[PDB]
Amino acid sequence: IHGEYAAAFKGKAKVYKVTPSNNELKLSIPYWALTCDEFLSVAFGGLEGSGRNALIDKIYELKLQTLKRQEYEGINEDSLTVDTPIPFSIHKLWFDLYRA
17 - beta bridge partners? Answer: 26
For its own copies, the closer CB: 21 or 65: 65
**Closest to 52 in 3D by CA, of 86, 43, 29:** 43
**Residue numbers 17-76 binding its own copies by CB under 8 A:** 53, 56, 72-75
Size of the residue set binding its own copies (CB under 8 A) = 13
| Beta carbons of 24 and 17 less than 8 angstroms apart | yes
Please identify which residue in 43, 66, 67, 84 interacts with its own copies, judged by CB under 8 A.
84
User: Between 56 and 93, whose beta carbon lies closer to its own copies?
Assistant: 56
| Minimum gap (Å) between residue 62 Cβ and its own copies | 15
Cα–Cα distance between 55 and 61 in angstroms, integer?
A: 10
